[PDB]
Ligand binder design. Structure first.
Ligand SMILES: *[C@@H]1O[C@H](CO)[C@@H](O)[C@H](O)[C@H]1NC(C)=O
Ligand SMILES: *[C@@H]1O[C@H](CO)[C@@H](O)[C@H](O)[C@H]1NC(C)=O
Lengths: 58, 307, 307
């Protein structure tokens, strides 16, 4: 609804490799940081650090 | 794109804003250069010159309130207001970056620190004996400052984005009440200060602040309110509001700043927090995402181009 | 069901852990009651009794490092390790909540604060003339503490979740180190301390900490390392590591705690930050989300029953 529109502004045009397709889904939807709106500052930093991990590269 | 202009508190913290020298160092090796008010109601307010006419995305972030006393519970976070605005070349944008409200603990006073670590229980003692706090006041955090983004018209400032600050956490606040946000967008509603009581209330957009411990309004300098008067003469509880209309701290929590200042406990209830401020977005703009409490610590301002 | 036990630092901050009195107030009106070690290597470690046999999701959050000097750049955040574990009824879980490493700026000393705001340039002067920092040491933040979740066997502690802490930001750190995370899962790999040099290294799981300014290991009390020896007797740079193996601060950044402690600059380079710690997850669990730097300030522990 709106979580998707807000968090993209924080992280920008982030890209995720196919190896992190389920890693992204688990982090975005199931982690406590990305489910409580008060911790959206945390979720933005989580997704950004995910893209630079060795798994999500290329 | 390198249109990423980020505004911070320039390292300043407390009831007063940053200086011109502080922001010159904070924005070193950056693409940003601003003017800072040196005295008067514009003291601590950053002035930025808009470089080009385009559609801008203005991301406003309020500041969080102060920590509690012995409990040190989760502080009330600041409010985020993200808007889309049309700006013209050479427009002078005034930016006040909200600063965090002062925490209760730790403190520099010898007697106070013994209360913070739980060794001095005079506060708990007076509560058990006389059912309320009347003599040994203090222990709550100060109200957080709000972030104001406005541009001057002919002679009157006109607000664009106001990101309300979070209220101060009370001394014995074992609960976080989970209070919802508030956002106004009708300029005919005047943004007065909050209902200041024992603890100071939040500073609004345009009011006449009388009490020292209440947060000053935006047009009055938005200086953080001083500590509780009763928390003085007995302690050194200098728990003041954050720059941006933050209310002063007492046994109860102080009110946070914003367009309409947050309310405060009227009878010095040690378990009752101060209320958060009211945010504001101009009708001429478009709200990208509704207001959400997200910000911990000082506030920020972010301007970019995506459209 | 949404039964969540949340563990915090109980209001404690700095190189030492919380007290029993601090945690008794921090968990008031909650469903949580823990024991706190009063003396010895368990001082400041919270002990929680598992209420029922079920599948638990333990979410560990490390603590961030200290802020830089005059630059006041973004501090190195702590690491988050989220895992799924099977626990039995009456199991005694030991939890050490990592505390933030002490910041360099701002400070309460009048002479120090002029260095933070950029008015006193003695530090920059000595660097320009004699190519390195030898006399006026200090200005970097302390190493952040790590979050340890372990349970005692017959006589030996066995780790389950270790959320590494972030390294301390150096004084003249124009760079942010841009560093990836590290996560170990083989208990046969021994978690020694970091490479302590001029600034203190991070405290590990099981080591023999000798240097005062180096972070102590978990089995040695995990006390935050003291400030730089050369940063004393010339200034008051009390920039110490956070509770949980944080390294002491110097002109360079201190090392962060974790399973394997973060390294530190060997020659007191004012532009070199301390390195972050190494996280750990027990083979008995399942990694829900890989290790990610998310936490700013103190760490946390959250249990939420995932599958
Ligand atoms: C409680 O009694 C009176 C309040 O009327 C006050 O003077 C006294 O000091 C209080 N006692 C304590 C222990 O605070
Ligand atoms: C740099 O020069 C010498 C070391 O060669 C030293 O005595 C002097 O004090 C240094 N200058 C400063 C400003 O520290």
């Amino acid at each position: 609804r709106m979580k998707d529109k807000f968090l993209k502004h924080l992280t920008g045009p982030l890209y995720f490799s196919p190896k992190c397709s389920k890693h992204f889904h688990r982090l975005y939807h199931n982690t406590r940081d990305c489910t409580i709106p008060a911790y959206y500052k945390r979720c933005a930093r989580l997704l950004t650090r995910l893209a630079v991990s060795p798994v999500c590269m290329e | 794109p390198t249109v990423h202009w980020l505004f911070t508190t320039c390292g300043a913290s407390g009831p007063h804003g940053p200086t011109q020298a502080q922001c010159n160092n904070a924005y070193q090796n950056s693409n940003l250069s601003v003017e800072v008010g040196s005295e008067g109601p514009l003291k601590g307010i950053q002035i930025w010159k808009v470089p080009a006419t385009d559609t801008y995305s203005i991301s406003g972030y309020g500041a969080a309130g102060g920590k509690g006393g012995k409990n040190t519970m989760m502080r009330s976070h600041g409010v985020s207001v993200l808007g889309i605005f049309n700006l013209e070349k050479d427009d002078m944008l005034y930016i006040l970056v909200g600063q965090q409200g002062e925490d209760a603990c730790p403190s520099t006073n010898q007697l106070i620190q013994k209360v913070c670590i739980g060794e001095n229980n005079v506060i708990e003692e007076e509560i058990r004996v006389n059912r309320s706090v009347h003599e040994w006041a203090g222990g709550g955090g100060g109200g957080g400052g709000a972030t104001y983004v406005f541009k001057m018209k002919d002679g009157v400032p006109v607000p664009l984005i106001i990101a309300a600050g979070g209220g101060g956490r009370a001394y014995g606040a074992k609960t976080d009440t989970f209070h919802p946000e508030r956002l106004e967008n009708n300029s005919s509603v005047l943004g007065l200060n909050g209902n200041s009581g024992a603890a100071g209330g939040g500073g609004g957009w345009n009011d006449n602040t009388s009490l020292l411990w209440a947060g000053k309004s935006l047009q009055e300098g938005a200086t953080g309110g001083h500590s509780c008067p009763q928390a003085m003469k007995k302690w050194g509880w200098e728990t003041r509001g954050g720059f941006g209309g933050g209310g002063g701290g007492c046994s109860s929590g102080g009110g946070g700043g914003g367009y309409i200042g947050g309310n405060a406990a009227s009878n010095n209830d040690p378990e009752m927090d101060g209320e958060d401020g009211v945010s504001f977005i101009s009708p001429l703009g478009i709200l990208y995402t509704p207001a959400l409490k997200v910000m911990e610590g000082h506030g920020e301002v972010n301007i970019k181009h995506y459209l």
